[PDB]
């Protein structure tokens, strides 16, 4: 649509513009941090909890024919081995540890499961809840014919091979995704009410899943393979709109990636285009806090727009990309929030996609601020990984102090 008018990221609440970094970082950073929090996402009651234990349950050093070190790791949160826990798997190229030097990291949620990502028979079955939706389950759970299920939105083997290690965890180690799902998810005991129903203000799913990358982070600053300074989130889709308030809020992530993340994600809501948010709350009602249910039908009322979301990853390095059949995500939504975004990075000296409009498909616009349309519809493709990868070469933290 054409009919909207955005707030501008660099006016304060109070109008006063905001002309430096500091400023930006100081005072318009959490100013915008708790808007989003209150309005659209819901609270993160805190971060770490206390007595988080990491056991390495597996370790095998010759994984993928001798390519990859493979471990899996047991997150739990608290000390009492009852504790809840999520499974991080981690594979790491065996080039890198050879020489030993720490590798870079490519971090992100998996829909369905840690065994899906990749055939690899070792990879723990996940014993947890799955949707009908995930394919070869059976009675909400995985079965042997589910692993490498996924394995086209993760292409291992060329990541390792460029350098970078990949770590993932299956989102519903965090939040089931299923309407229901917040009464077994990391809300239903960090920070938890007595009782009743969930606060307006309250986190839902996005919130939980964004948590849960911000723990693998911490349990990665832990690892000696890795450097936990050079950490991209990434996502797809749900989990995109996951990576991104996981690196808006958290800023030691170093490098973001929203892969087709849509309304709620990097797509504009006042552009009433495709997905709505009536539409995502109504579909989905436990994945934002029940405040942005105020803004069904009515989001000329929102105070912020995910622009703002994207501002919030200044000055570290976003990517954000669509898909040119993908209508309901918003594609021009997803582009033109990051030329809303671009006067943010252009005070941190960064620079974005530099054309009038969506650029053609497969040829990427921008620096540290980065934006491409693939053709084909939602998914997430070789293609969005190969330039994904030569950003991360690129623009990702390097490994010599400055
Ligand atoms: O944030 C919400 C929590 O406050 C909620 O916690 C539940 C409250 O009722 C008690 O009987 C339960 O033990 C407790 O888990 O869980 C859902 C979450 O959305
Ligand atoms: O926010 C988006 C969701 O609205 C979207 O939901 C899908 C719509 O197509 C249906 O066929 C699917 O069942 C449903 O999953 O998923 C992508 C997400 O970004
Ligand atoms: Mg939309």
Known sequence: HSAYTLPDPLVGADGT??????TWQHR???????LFAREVYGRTPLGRPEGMVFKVTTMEHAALGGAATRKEVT???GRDPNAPSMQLLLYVPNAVIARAERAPVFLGLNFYGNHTVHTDPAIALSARWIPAEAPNGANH??????????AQKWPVEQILARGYAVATVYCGD???DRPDGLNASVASWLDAAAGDQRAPDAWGAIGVWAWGLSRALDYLETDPLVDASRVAVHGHSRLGKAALWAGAQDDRFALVIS????????????????????????????????????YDDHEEALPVDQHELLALVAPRPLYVASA??????????????????????????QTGPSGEDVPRVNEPSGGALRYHI????????????????????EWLKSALPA
């Open 75 to 77: 997150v739990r949160f």
């Open 174 to 176: 965090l939040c089931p």
């Open 141 to 150: 759970r995985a079965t042997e014919a589910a692993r490498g299920s996924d």
């Open 324 to 349: 040119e059949d993908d209508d309901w995500a918003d594609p021009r939504g997803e582009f033109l929030a990051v030329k809303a975004a671009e006067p943010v990075f252009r005070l941190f000296g």
């Open 17 to 22: 513009r905001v002309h430096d970094r500091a």
């Open 374 to 393: 693939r053709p084909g519809p939602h998914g997430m493709t070789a293609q969005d990984w190969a330039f994904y990868l030569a950003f991360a070469d």
């Open 28 to 34: 318009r950073r959490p100013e915008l941090l708790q």
């Open 259 to 294: 892969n087709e993340s849509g309304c709620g994600g990097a797509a504009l809501s006042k552009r009433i285009h495709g997905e709505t948010v009536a539409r995502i709350n109504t579909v989905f009602p436990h994945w934002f806090a029940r405040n942005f249910r105020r």
